[PDB]
Amino acid sequence: VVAAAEKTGVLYVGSKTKEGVVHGVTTVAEKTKEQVTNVGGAVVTGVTAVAQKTVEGAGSIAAAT
Amino acid sequence: VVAAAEKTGVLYVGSKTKEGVVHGVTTVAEKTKEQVTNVGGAVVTGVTAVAQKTVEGAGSIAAAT
Amino acid sequence: VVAAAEKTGVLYVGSKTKEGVVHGVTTVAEKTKEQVTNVGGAVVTGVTAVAQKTVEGAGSIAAAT
Amino acid sequence: VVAAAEKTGVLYVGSKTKEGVVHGVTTVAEKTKEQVTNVGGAVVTGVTAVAQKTVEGAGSIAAAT
Amino acid sequence: VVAAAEKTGVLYVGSKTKEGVVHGVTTVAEKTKEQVTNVGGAVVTGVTAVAQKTVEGAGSIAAAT
Amino acid sequence: VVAAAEKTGVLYVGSKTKEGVVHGVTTVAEKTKEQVTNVGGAVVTGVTAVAQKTVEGAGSIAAAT
Amino acid sequence: VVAAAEKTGVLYVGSKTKEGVVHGVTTVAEKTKEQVTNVGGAVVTGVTAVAQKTVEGAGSIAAAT
Amino acid sequence: VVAAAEKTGVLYVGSKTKEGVVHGVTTVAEKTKEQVTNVGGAVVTGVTAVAQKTVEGAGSIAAAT
Structure with missing residues (x-):
């Protein structure tokens, strides 16, 4: 289990909402052994969610669950 | 299990909403052994979700579940 | 379980909301052995969530759960 | 379990909210053995959450749970 | 203008609503001389409106607008 | 302008509402001479409005506006 | 302008509301000469409004506006 | 302008509210000569408003406005 990585205007957002439920x-589980969450990049969440110029480098994830 | 990676205007969003439910x-599981979530990139979520210039580098994921 | 990584405008957001629930x-689990959450990058959450120029270096995650 | 990492405008956010619940x-678990949360990057949470120029160096996480 | 008047169980209401607008x-007028409203009886108004055994006597209205 | 008048169980209301606007x-007028409101009976108003055994006598209203 | 009047169980209300606006x-007027409001009976107003056994006598209203 | 009047169980209210605005x-007027409000009966106002056995005598209102 090996991972490797190498590296060498106007944005307008207007939102009008009354009710917002975001995941x-x-x-989710009821009976399980293992629950694993690796975030090497970006997780951006919300009623209004904006990502600009994210995850622009070198990332690596090795999992052996 | 080996992974490897190498690397060497106007955006207007306007939204009107009353009810929004976003996943x-x-x-989701009821009986399981393992639950793995790797994100080397980007997960952008919402009622209004804008991603600009994301995941522009080098990423590698190696899972052996 | 080995991971390695190497590296060598106007943004306007306006949001009008009345009710917002964000995760x-x-x-979530009821019976489990292990629960693991590694955040090498960025988790950005909220009713209004903006991420600009994040996760631009070198990151690695190794999990052997 | 080895991890290694090496490295060598106007942002306007306006939000009008009445009710906000953010996680x-x-x-969450009811019966478990282990619960692990490593934060090598950034976790930014709030009703209004803005992250600019975060996680731009070298980070490594190694968990052998 | 003359008016004259002379006189000699289980009610279950369950309601579930999310938004109610009631008049x-x-x-309503924009240009007028006279605006008259006589209620010798009963005006019962609402999202949930219940009237039981109302206006059971003697009433008289004489208007000469 | 003459008016004359002469006279000689279980009620369960359960309501679940989230938003209610009641008049x-x-x-309402913009240009007018006279605005008259005589209430000899009963005006009952609200998100939950209940009237039981109201206006059971003698009422008279004489208006010569 | 003459008016004349002469005369000779379980109520359960349960209400669960989050927002209520009641008139x-x-x-209402912008330009007017006269504004008159006689209440010989009962005006009962509110998010929960209950009127039981009201306006059960003798009432008379005479207006010559 | 003459008016004349002559005369010879369990109530449970439960209310759970978060926001109430009641008139x-x-x-209301902007330019007017006269504004008259005679209250011979009862005006009961509130987020929870309960009137039981009110306005049961003799009432007379005479206005020559």
């Missing part, structure tokens, strides 16, 4: 990364 | 990356 | 990275 | 990184 | 006796 | 007897 | 007897 | 008898 991002969700993991 | 992004969801994993 | 970011969520892990 | 960031959440881990 | 009763309404009189 | 009763309303008189 | 009873309302008279 | 009873309201008279």
